[PDB]
Amino acid sequence: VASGSGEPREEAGALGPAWDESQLRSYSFPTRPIPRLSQSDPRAEELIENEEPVVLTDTNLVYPALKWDLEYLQENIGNGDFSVYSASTHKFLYYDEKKMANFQNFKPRSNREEMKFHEFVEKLQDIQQRGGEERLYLQQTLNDTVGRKIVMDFLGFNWNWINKQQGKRGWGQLTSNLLLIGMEGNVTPAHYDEQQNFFAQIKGYKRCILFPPDQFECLYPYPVHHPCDRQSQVDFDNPDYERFPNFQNVVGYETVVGPGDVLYIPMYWWHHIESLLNGGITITVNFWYKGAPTPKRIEYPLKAHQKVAIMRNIEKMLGEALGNPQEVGPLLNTMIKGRYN
Amino acid sequence: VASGSGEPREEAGALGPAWDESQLRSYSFPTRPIPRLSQSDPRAEELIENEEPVVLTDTNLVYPALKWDLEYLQENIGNGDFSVYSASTHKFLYYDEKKMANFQNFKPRSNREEMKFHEFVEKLQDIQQRGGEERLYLQQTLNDTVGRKIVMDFLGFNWNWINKQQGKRGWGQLTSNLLLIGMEGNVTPAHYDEQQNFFAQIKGYKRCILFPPDQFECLYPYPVHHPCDRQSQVDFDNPDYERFPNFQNVVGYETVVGPGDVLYIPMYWWHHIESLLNGGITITVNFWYKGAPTPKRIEYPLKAHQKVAIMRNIEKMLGEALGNPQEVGPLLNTMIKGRYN
Ligand SMILES: O=C(O)CCC(=O)C(=O)O
Ligand SMILES: O=C(O)CCC(=O)C(=O)O
Ligand SMILES: [Fe+3]
Ligand SMILES: [Fe+3]
């Protein structure tokens, strides 16, 4: 069946339903649930190996961070600069700034702004106070500038477990940790990443809807050279079935993560991420790993994600070869019309 | 204007019109005429340099061959084997046999058959006698097996001129000479070649209709892996404007060549070639040269033929990468639909 996130979990000590159906937004497509399992369960091990998602409930991956909140973070995080995205709507579509050059009819809806942790917390309190509508999303890699207590927290993460995950899966190296702190209601729309991700939930509840790589045809990513490379063009709240007809065949896997849970988001899987409505602020930390190196003699049949890799390369190379990304489309069309379609 | 081949030329000594409009087949598109010039004319030199076609009237390129006919050729050409194509219609669509593997729903309309020069001449006389409908086209590279008088003829060709053409244009090496002998009415449908061609007419008259490389979009070549790679899909006698809508925007350059004339067919230019109706058998010899080597830093904007080269490579590589040519189309579609179209 398509229950989706399933029946909401009961919090220990009878503290009530963690959340309820009405904090979820409404969408056109059906979904089946990502399995929640224990890291000891061999089924979870089997899933990570086959590059399918799984929610792990007992890793303790970021145990020391479960105590983080705004106040504790203000007090310890340091005086470094924190990237903070802004938006006039719940949807935070992201831009790659290095690509804004080559698409001029691209004024952004969501601006970046550097600031200090305290400033972010002020802007948030200011907004919350006045009862404004505007939304913010802090997203910042963890680097040297951070307080000693945070460095201690960080050191208390379950390295033993994750490093064994990296080693068993052949993955490359931890490339970064990203800290995400967001306001209730905020959405990160569907996109895919090229790295393996352990997505570690800390404060609050997020609804995570994933689509496998094989559903490329239904999600209609932006062109590789467009600033929104790797994002879906389809507006989940108002989908345009004339432009994106196969969006009507899309089927997601969904789940709700809370404090202590870790979502394996396999490489190239689409993910759409929402912080529950009226559920407070949310906090998450990612663990991004370069995926395993591509093997020597490619075995057929190919995996979907490899076909996705191929399409990407074709677009990149055609962009250089022609000396201008804007010409990629007309040439692709010229190549198929009346020939392959 | 679109006269096309222009007013038929008058043969010397008042022997009458070489040919007339009614030996030409009828087509949907308009054409303007390829200039006829003298090899001494600097305009002709300018045309070959800019890779545009030109008919040269006084090269003497194959002067010794102007005396060839079936009888003289039978008597001297040798006992080697001659490739001979057969067809139940005036159109000789060609197959690349090495590619027939990977498209099984491809029974051929025109079969190849090895035979000896005399056999060809018999089969032709047999057919002509009985008053049959079936058509033959001899097409065979000139190789070592040939008679001494033919080797003498061949040695009498104007090497001095052509070799200076090769040298001034930076072209690579003569790759071959192809001998074409055909029956009145025979058509070679539109296709392009990857080499530079001096097309040397010997006996009879052929109507040559060329389209520049930039008209790729209107001629709809077969897929690179299909046996008819490099041929147009569009049936010139009954064009399907639903499948091939831009064929309605096509504009050819045409001409009629006779004994003594040489048509420069530049690399990548489409050419459609017909032996005039009720005009007797025709004879031609090609001179194929590898084109100049591709320069070091590619200057923008690119030439049409370079874009054509690019499309070809994209298709070849996608074929290997995916391990199966039949998958090239679905992936290309997946790549554009809703993304670039
Ligand atoms: O938490 C979010 O809203 C974004 C998560 C995400 O896109 C990722 O970690 O890959
Ligand atoms: O003469 C013909 O019919 C074919 C000529 C041709 O295709 C060529 O020489 O490239
Ligand atoms: Fe992501
Ligand atoms: Fe040709």
Curated annotation (Swiss-Prot), chains A, B:
Q: Which SUPFAM superfamilies does this entry report, sorted A to Z?
A: Clavaminate synthase-like
Q: What is its main location?
A: nucleus
Where's the JmjC domain?
A: 134-304
The region called Interaction with VHL is annotated at: 1-117
Residues annotated as binding substrate? D144, Q173, L174, T175, D193, E194, Q195, R230, Q231, A292, N313
Cell compartments where the protein resides: Nucleus; Cytoplasm; Cytoplasm, Perinuclear region
Catalytic reactions on record: L-asparaginyl-[hypoxia-inducible factor alpha subunit] + 2-oxoglutarate + O2 = (3S)-3-hydroxy-L-asparaginyl-[hypoxia-inducible factor alpha subunit] + succinate + CO2; L-histidyl-[ankyrin-repeat domain protein] + 2-oxoglutarate + O2 = (3S)-3-hydroxy-L-histidyl-[ankyrin-repeat domain protein] + succinate + CO2; L-asparaginyl-[ankyrin-repeat domain protein] + 2-oxoglutarate + O2 = (3S)-3-hydroxy-L-asparaginyl-[ankyrin-repeat domain protein] + succinate + CO2; L-aspartyl-[ankyrin-repeat domain protein] + 2-oxoglutarate + O2 = (3S)-3-hydroxy-L-aspartyl-[ankyrin-repeat domain protein] + succinate + CO2
* Residue ranges crossing the lipid bilayer per the database entry: none
Annotated GO MF terms:
[protein]-asparagine 3-dioxygenase activity; ankyrin repeat binding; carboxylic acid binding; ferrous iron binding; NF-kappaB binding; Notch binding; oxygen sensor activity; peptidyl-aspartic acid 3-dioxygenase activity
EC numbers listed for it are 1.14.11.30, 1.14.11.n4
InterPro entries with a match to the protein in the record: Cupin_8, FIH-1_dom_II, JmjC_dom, RmlC-like_jellyroll
Q: What is this protein called?
A: Hypoxia-inducible factor 1-alpha inhibitor
UniProt organism field: Homo sapiens (Human)
Gene responsible for this protein = HIF1AN
